[PDB]
């Protein structure tokens, strides 16, 4: 099923990558939140 | 077929993985937001304490100076 | 594209869509609180 | 049943929307991270400023007190 499976495959790969980037930003965000707790010490 | 195109079973597979991850992200974000709240309350309390403590020494200073003026003249 | 596959594909897709709706919800809460940080120093 | 199943075309369309939504989500978190760093540096600076002003007042208070008792 070229152009359709091909397309779905492309789209599923972009989604995966993109969500990897979100996890990245959350990680950073959690790190900053950690330091915040250290501010109040 | 093409190595670089998913078979239907591979498609379904990718979908299941994405479900897992997305679910993980949801719970992670929930935990992140609870952390935000907690930090917010912590900083709120802490800044307030900083203000009070300054206020105290500021007033103490003011009164000490008033007394210095009144009792020298 | 087969029936079984599309059904499971459709079910996954709807779930991801729904799960994402809740994720943006969280994002919105995060933003709300972040805005509030800006006012901690201000009196 | 038949209505409640997506077509390949429709599935693809959801993929596009979902990607877009995830992209917006990622970018919005990038900005949040930047803003938080800002908030953090602002709060660090602020508290340092409060501390300084505090121990300034504390010094001024003690100096007003000993100088008062300095006479006579």
Numbering used by the authors:
A (entry chain D): 679 to 719
B (entry chain B): 30 to 102
C (entry chain C): 678 to 720
D (entry chain A): 30 to 101
Paper text:
OPTN is an ubiquitin-binding autophagy receptor, which is initially found to participate in the xenophagy and aggrephagy processes, and more recently is also demonstrated to involve in the PARKIN-dependent mitophagy. The N-terminal coiled-coil region of OPTN is responsible for its interaction with TANK-binding kinase 1 (TBK1), which is a noncanonical IκB kinase family member involved in innate immunity and autophagy. Here we biochemically and structurally characterize the interaction between OPTN and TBK1, and demonstrate that the direct association of OPTN N-terminal coiled-coil domain (NTD) with TBK1 CTD domain is responsible for the OPTN/TBK1 complex formation. The structures of OPTN NTD in complex with TBK1 CTD and the related NAP1/TBK1 complex solved in this study not only elucidate the detailed molecular mechanism underlying the OPTN and TBK1 interaction but also uncover a general interaction mode governing TBK1's binding to all of its currently identified binding adaptor proteins.
Among the OPTN mutations, the glaucoma-associated E50K mutation is demonstrated to associate with a more progressive and severe disease phenotype, and causes death of retinal ganglion cells in transgenic mice. To our surprise, the overall structure of the mutant complex is almost the same as that of the OPTN(26–103)/TBK1(677–729) complex. Given that the OPTN/TBK1 complex is a symmetrical tetramer, these additional synergic interactions induced by the E50K mutation likely contribute to the increase of binding affinity observed between OPTN E50K mutant and TBK1. Interestingly, multi-angle light scattering (MALS) analysis revealed that the E50K mutation could change the oligomeric state of OPTN N-terminal region (residues 1–119) and induce its tetramerization.
